[PDB]
Amino acid sequence: GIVEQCCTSICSLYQLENYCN
Amino acid sequence: GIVEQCCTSICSLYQLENYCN
Amino acid sequence: FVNQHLCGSHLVEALYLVCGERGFFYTPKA
Amino acid sequence: FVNQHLCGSHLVEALYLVCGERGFFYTPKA
């Protein structure tokens, strides 16, 4: 989930945009 | 939508919780 | 604190605080 | 500014800034 990918480890733009509508 | 209900007019807890998962 | 005009990042912050570990969705257009 | 550890309200703020008028969903558990 987003916390594991962006909080616990380093985030990326690719990952964040996966959560845009 | 949420902007019309909470930004353009006064928000409420009822409305906000409608957008919780 | 939710009974006021909440816009932009202020609205997103209120959702964050109110919804907590449930999370939320933010859809300004639809 | 997105290539770092983003937690809690900081993560939500980044989603807000990156997704813009598209909006986003924030699901910390799932």
> If you write DSSP's letter for every residue of A4-21 in order, what string do you get?
HHHTTTT--HHHHHTTB-
The whole-angstrom separation of Cα C22 and Cα D14 is 19
Residues 6+ apart with CB under 8 A from C13: D9, D12
The DSSP line for B1-21 is -HHHHHTTTT--HHHHHTTB-
Experimental technique of record: X-ray
Q: Which domain holds residue D19?
A: 1-30
**Cβ contact, residue pair D25, C28, below 8 Å:** no
Tell which residue, C13, B12, D28, has the closest CA to residue A2: D28
Chain D nearest-CA residue for B19: D25
Dig out the tokens for D18 from the structure.
């990156």
Chain A nearest-CA residue for C26: A21
Partner B contacted by C30 (CB < 8 A) = yes
Maximal C-alpha separation, chain A: 23
Query: Length of chain C in residues, anyone?
Result: 30
Query: How many structural domains compose chain D?
Result: 1
Contact D11, C23 (CB under 8 A): no
Dig out the tokens for C7 from the structure.
């816009």
